[PDB]
């Protein structure tokens, strides 16, 4: 007996309600004078149930007003043009009608494999260049690792590609600087459970061929650590660690992927990755030396020091250069081992090696 | 006189209600036209009581709508196939029906013994690789220690094993780094009372044979401190402490389990544990020396220093090496005492001892 409302005015009535195996089917009727205003496309939204949602800015009361809730009824969102097809789905609220989401579980737009990540169970937003795109729907266990299902909107499904790489950031992150600090402009689920970001690269298609699924990286940089991989053989690990930058003339060109002992225990193997742009810099005769920490100087007649709030002090930078020479040794192949120098070459600031590109 | 609802439409009625010793028993009737839609499996959920739950994302109003609460009734969750057995339990809300949890106290999936831990009284989640699995139901006193009861879901009861080891983390933990800091993506009870994590190891079955119950470790590392246990005899404790790392060529291979005086008071016994992977590194002729703190150098003609934001500065690392020699002294047995060297061996960077594995 419920009414049937368009634009706040009743234009029809629910005739009857029949229970089937799959669920309820209603039959409704529209008056002829309002028949021409539905026009083949429309959406039907439940108005018989109140639904108060609370947001930080989202104060909203959907489904009904109190005067209209006692009457109940079905709201019509009219469309422009259509055909008057035989059946129409009924959407439980306005938002699902807008999303065209008749079901409850959104489809898995993409699946990710990640072993151990303190991420959302379901609900954190996906960000493309920190622009809100989709959401996480499910995390499920598997023998290999986690299995994380992401649904994003069809409008943005062009944004994901073969070169899309995904990194997770968990919880509330605040960024500190020398002058002042900021808090991330976090939405709800970002503040609660932590979002997942992704971006497209150039050679990341090579990152997709490895592994049957895209791997959710633990950090933004670990997602970006692509390019030439080399090994340096240091007699001790010292102050290095994972994510420690690699510096050419004071500019970061790569990171330390990881480090461990060799198959023999005399040396320590340090896996590094240089980005593709600077991949041509590394040559077979290149020299690598540790640049960790503040290396001041002293003289008997006068002492001169240096301080530069080094990131190398925070994370011990490995520096490298190339001795000059007309016949250039070619680019280092993948996995080319090297040897760490305990000290700088004295003329590394004086070396001139006009590398191409 | 209450109705009986399937899919939002009444398909039956409560005939009567009889009080027994154990509790109430209802008799209900279903119309023949809807008889074929129950199909032997179903669940019956109370709809006569409203239940508003509040969550950070969990805004939900379970049990009834206002129009349906005056009518009351019992909701049916239909199943696929069955037998129409004689009796069916009645679940107090939708969630317990989904959990198939007719009772109120979940069964103790596992019990843990821990002396003093600032953990949840009841309700914090259990994490496998920080994936939500179960919950803590009870902490109870005992003459030995606490006794902590954990219930996890039957779907994940394959995950626990003889090699499962458990460590507690309490309250809200935030992780700081040199570049920026993050907050743990904590759920409610993690933020309030602190979760319990667990993981499976290789030799942790040996960790289960010791002790009649699994012991809840106070930290993640204290749970992982398994392997070779040795003693070093230092003349003073100095800067060491529990959890202080043990460093081979700058790589952490073990920790300091604990330290105390000997049965005589001249020396200090420091219990250490080296992990199994590096267990072959320790030989009977190995040399241990303190590496705590920043050890700079100075010369009369020129002074050279070193800084590396040492974890050794934060927690004084004990370093060890092995002098070279063709007849290798075998692996150190359990409890083999050693002697701390006040200074480095000068050629420890030059020693070559190609240990296997």
Swiss-Prot record, chains A, B:
It is found in: Cell inner membrane. Changing residue 314 to N: Loss of activity. Induction: Induced by a defect in lipopolysaccharide molecules. It comes from the Bacteria. Residues 227-342 are annotated as: MCE/MlaD 7. Disruption phenotype: The letAB mutant is not sensitive to lauryl sulfobetaine (LSB), but the pqiAB-letAB double mutant is more sensitive to LSB than the pqiAB mutant. Double mutation also increases sensitivity of the pqiAB mutant to caprylyl sulfobetaine. Forms a tunnel that spans the entire periplasmic space. Is probably involved in the transport of lipids between the inner membrane and the outer membrane through the tunnel. Forms a dynamic tunnel sufficiently long to mediate lipid transport directly between the two membranes without the need for a shuttle protein. Binds phospholipids. Lipids bind inside the tunnel. Required for outer membrane homeostasis. Contributes to membrane integrity. Belongs to the PqiB family. Homohexamer. May interact with LetA in the inner membrane. May also interact with partners in the outer membrane. The seven MCE (Mammalian Cell Entry) domains of a single protomer of LetB resemble seven beads on a string. Six copies of this linearly configured protomer associate laterally to form a homohexameric assembly. The LetB hexamers form an elongated tube consisting of seven stacked MCE rings, each formed from the association of six identical MCE domains, with a central tunnel. Rings 1, 5, 6 and 7 are dynamic and adopt open and closed states. This is Lipophilic envelope-spanning tunnel protein B. The chain holds residues 747 to 877 of 877 of the full protein.
